Each structure stands twice: as structure tokens, then as C-alpha cells.
């Protein structure tokens, strides 16, 4: 809450990845299902937060957390029970904490 506009595009570059969420399962670990398409880029112990989720809007009002990939397209995060019901849409994505000036494992190196 305006803290998105007031805020630091400290983001360098690198937009959070954001992937269409298929659907999420009231569970803990909470377990949640994405789009074929939505790739995304999420690692395990990473950051997400969501966006235009329906019914779990608490995910929409929640700080990012932490998550697990199950599958490529399935991953696990706190509790869901601990968001709300999940009717529909959702969008999440990656959010990394905002690190000082320094060099972290990066995701496997890209090859050209």
C-alpha cells in the first residue's frame, strides 16, 4: 500500500518473474498448481508474492513468503489455510528480498 509507490527500484534490471497460478490448495504446507505457460522462475526457499488471486486474497494482502516447488509447475508455500479459500485466477510472483550490492549463486548461468 503506497509503499509500492514509494519504494526503491532497487529491482535492478530484474522484474520479479510473475506466473499465472492455475490453483491453490487450502493445505500445510499449502500446495498450489501453475500455469503450463507460467513459468515461474521460482526457487526453492524463494520469495513470492501474489497478485489478482480470488477468494485467497489474503495471498493478494499478504508479504511475500517462502516456497518450495513440488513439481515444475506445483509449489508449496506456508499455509493456505492460513490465507483463505481459493476461488480463482492469481497471479504470483518471485520476489527475491532486496539485497545490498553483492554477489549471490545466481540462477544457472545463461549460455549464448
Given at each position: 500500500?503506497?509503499?509500492?509507490?514509494?519504494?526503491?527500484?532497487?529491482?535492478?534490471?530484474?522484474?520479479?518473474?510473475?506466473?499465472?497460478?492455475?490453483?491453490?490448495?487450502?493445505?500445510?504446507?499449502?500446495?498450489?498448481?501453475?500455469?503450463?505457460?507460467?513459468?515461474?522462475?521460482?526457487?526453492?526457499?524463494?520469495?513470492?508474492?501474489?497478485?489478482?488471486?480470488?477468494?485467497?486474497?489474503?495471498l493478494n494482502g499478504?508479504?511475500?513468503?517462502?516456497?518450495?516447488?513440488?513439481?515444475?509447475?506445483?509449489?508449496?508455500?506456508?499455509?493456505?489455510?492460513?490465507?483463505?479459500?481459493?476461488?480463482?485466477?492469481?497471479?504470483?510472483?518471485?520476489?527475491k528480498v532486496p539485497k545490498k550490492?553483492?554477489?549471490?549463486?545466481?540462477?544457472?548461468?545463461?549460455?549464448?
Amino acid at each position: 500500500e503506497f509503499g509500492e509507490e514509494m519504494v526503491l527500484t532497487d529491482s535492478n534490471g530484474e522484474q520479479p518473474l510473475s506466473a499465472m497460478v492455475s490453483m491453490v490448495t487450502k493445505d500445510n504446507p499449502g500446495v498450489v498448481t501453475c500455469l503450463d505457460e507460467a513459468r515461474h522462475g521460482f526457487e526453492t526457499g524463494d520469495f513470492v508474492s501474489f497478485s489478482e488471486v480470488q477468494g485467497m486474497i489474503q495471498l493478494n494482502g499478504c508479504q511475500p513468503m517462502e516456497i518450495k516447488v513440488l513439481g515444475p509447475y506445483t509449489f508449496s508455500i506456508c499455509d493456505t489455510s492460513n490465507f483463505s479459500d481459493y476461488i480463482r485466477g492469481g497471479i504470483v510472483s518471485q520476489v527475491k528480498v532486496p539485497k545490498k550490492i553483492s554477489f549471490k549463486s545466481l540462477p544457472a548461468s545463461l549460455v549464448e
